Amino acid sequence: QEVEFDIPPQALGSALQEFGRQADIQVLYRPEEVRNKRSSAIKGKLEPNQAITELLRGTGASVDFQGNAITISVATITEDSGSYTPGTIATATRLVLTPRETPQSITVVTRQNMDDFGLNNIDDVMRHTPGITVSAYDTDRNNYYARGFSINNFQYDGIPSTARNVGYSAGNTLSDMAIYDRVEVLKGATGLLTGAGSLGATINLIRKKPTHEFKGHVELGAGSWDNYRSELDVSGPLTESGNVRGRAVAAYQDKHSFMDHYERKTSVYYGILEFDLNPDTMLTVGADYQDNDPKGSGWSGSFPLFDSQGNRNDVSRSFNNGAKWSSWEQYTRTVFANLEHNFANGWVGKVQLDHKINGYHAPLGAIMGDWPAPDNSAKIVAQKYTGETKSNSLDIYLTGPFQFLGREHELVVGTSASFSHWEGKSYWNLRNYDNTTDDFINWDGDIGKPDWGTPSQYIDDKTRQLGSYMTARFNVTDDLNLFLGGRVVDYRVTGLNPTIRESGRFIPYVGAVYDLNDTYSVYASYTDIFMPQDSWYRDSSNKLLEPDEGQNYEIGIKGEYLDGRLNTSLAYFEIHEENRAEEDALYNSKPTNPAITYAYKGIKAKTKGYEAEISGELAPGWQVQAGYTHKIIRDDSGKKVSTWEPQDQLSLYTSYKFKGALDKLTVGGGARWQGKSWQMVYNNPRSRWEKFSQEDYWLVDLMARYQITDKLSASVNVNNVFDKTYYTNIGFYTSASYGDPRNLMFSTRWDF
């Protein structure tokens, strides 16, 4: 039937509510998709379907007709945006939201930020992520601190990594950025989609996808300490019809460092294909690979803190405790297939399979122990660790809208499964060779390579992980939105050690967001995560500790300007942990139970702090990424933990694009500051606890770029401009590690 209409120009949402009255139809729409837009004038006797299209002219909004009601939708990739701020995030719940819509701490490092500052691996990225502190273990191993906790949760297009034991590092901590669009760090307790994991944060990595128009580049680089780099990216349609699309990228890097007899070379490959089956169904298959091959790898720091009889060691930044032949090899490869379908009711389901391999081949050799000796001699501890993890993952989810009280809401319902298997060899039963070296001062890593002998310990671990989850976002007011969600998990691990089993574990997700303006919004959330304890963490009665669990209490205010080209946020958080594995010196002074010698205690801990950050456009061609974070974490006795992670930290990185005849020049820079940190260490020769402190220090970088030809560009990066001599690790096995001296890296990019 034809109906008579009269609706003048007004704020879109009011005109939709009045359309329903003037057409006898129910109208379902998301207020946030509509607050920005505005309704065009309609007048006349028209058909409902024709009248609604005329009303929504110049907005690009979809209308889907079903029954006696109609639904309205007004709808990510960071590559080639020029922005340091994200568009949309589906990391938290799977629901595709804006930063301001999300009731959590979340920080995104964009393709542009990565290109601009020449961040080539995950380490460089973290060293530029506002609320994060990067400390070292040894040359080919680092630690990322967040809110008083180490980060053990690494995801790759949503699929969690099961190679979690950092004692056997196998790639997670040095992934090359050539194959990714962006890297998002979701802070707090992220159990909802991660499942079983740790507290602090979660690192999610999004892979590059094929374009529908041809696009490709070649970038060559050179830096300090014989540091070469090469990468090639090729993308676009592969059939005339364009029902298929592909993307292939290869990168190779070889380098040295300020440290002696040390080099690393990395090789990466990646290829992805897209298939259009019907107009609403798409298949994706892809494969990747990386290989980290070092020589002259260090172990447990760079040098010992004390000599033969205590005192204090003094050595140049170039000193490396590792032998020539020492190497910590780490290789990764993936094969995956995705499949998404769009259903008739605005609903969309996705199925992703994953097959991942994390391996290591680490013949190690370094000076460790209280050295040198009074005759300038020292000893080397030499061990060998080889292994491999094969991990198969299935995850499926459906997401779409639903009505309740004349309001449009959206739901997510999913299920996941994971089967992984970790096999490993360890050699320390050496067929007696000479440990000693003559010279400590003039150590150039020169010592023989031993016969490793037969394996000392075998590892053979099978892990099943099941998951089932649901999350809802209620549209109870225009200004107010309530999240109710949760996830149930089944964690089981079989192997040589006794079976670990947790059935029917539950993880809640509770969140609310209220709107004050068209600018500021307040939010609160309650989140949780747990991780089953490892075999050797046992109490006095030889019983296993209950899983390490924690909750994140967050409240704060977020901002948004220039319709999403700029975001501000200020939040206050509080993390309560239970079942933290600690010493128990009461038992360890005088053991009782013959079945265990070293026992543990499960205690509680509590981080309380706040955070302020900003990202995006500050002016037309002026981009920023900056944050301030304050934290203090305590035991249950009342003592500070993670004292090596600073209590106050400030990060700031900016770039300006010039105007006028010189719009071919770009100038940038960075400034990183952190407050004092310390570690309590034990002096063994002199039988005392000693305090080691690092003062507050600055870290400045500068950047300049020119768009030469039209296709050809060149850039320069200078890291640690002021050549600050500082430490990145102390208490780790009574060792120490310096931070990077002055840096340069030059680049040239072509763009086909």
Binding site: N165, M368, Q383, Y385, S426, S456, I459, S535
Partner: peptide, 8 residues
């Protein structure tokens, strides 16, 4: 506490 035997 990763099950490795360094000096121990």
């Amino acid at each position: 506490x990763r099950x490795k035997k360094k000096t121990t």
